[PDB]
Every structure is written in C-alpha cells, then in structure tokens.
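Give me structure tokens for this 132-residue protein.
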Amino acid sequence: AEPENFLEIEVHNPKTHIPNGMDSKGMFTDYEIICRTNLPSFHKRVSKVRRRYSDFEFFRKCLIKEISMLNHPKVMVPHLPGKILLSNRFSNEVIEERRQGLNTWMQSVAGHPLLQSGSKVLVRFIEAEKFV
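Here you go.
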C-alpha cells in the first residue's frame, strides 16, 4: 500500500447513444469517469462509471448541500462548465468542450482535501453504477 493518500481522476470517452428503435431511449450522451484512489472514504481502488451532463448538474447540487451540512460555510464549488448552450448539444464541438470542461472540473472537485476526507456524495458519484 502507498504510504500517502492519492486520487487520480479523468473524464473522457464521451459517447452519444444513437437510437436503433422507435421505442428505444431518446438520443443522449454520457461521459466516462475513471478514478483510482486509496482514500479511506472510498470502498474500492478503481471505479469506472458513466455520467450524463445532467448527472454532474445533480451532483453539484448535492455536493453543495452536503458541504453546508459538513459545516464548511466557506468552501466554494466552481461553476460546472459547458452549461450554456448556443450550439447543437450533439455536435462534436459541444461534446468535446464539455468533456474537457468536465475533466478539469472533476479533478478540481475530487482533488479538494476536505471533500476527499468528508464528502459521501463525492464517493457515490464516483463509485455507483447509477448515480441517484
């Protein structure tokens, strides 16, 4: 075991799911989050999950609420990038911009010492097959 705590995380592998049937789920895109860590708050070393941009939005709301409960009225969570949309949500432009933005955002959030030690939502967002 590594003597020091560590958390590696990346958001990549964006995928737009094309419907094949007239009754299949509506077209949508999600991103893969890959994380490796030895933090005591986590339950396994490697986690690989997929998340829609809306999952990140829900996560931010949940995280901000948990932080206030953890009594950290000064900790601030950055804006989620790529919220505004003036281009087709399924264009490579938008998806790549979201991928890059989400990657940077996730490393910033998951990299915060206080969230690493006391945030339960952070762990669930990274580990659960389905966030909800």
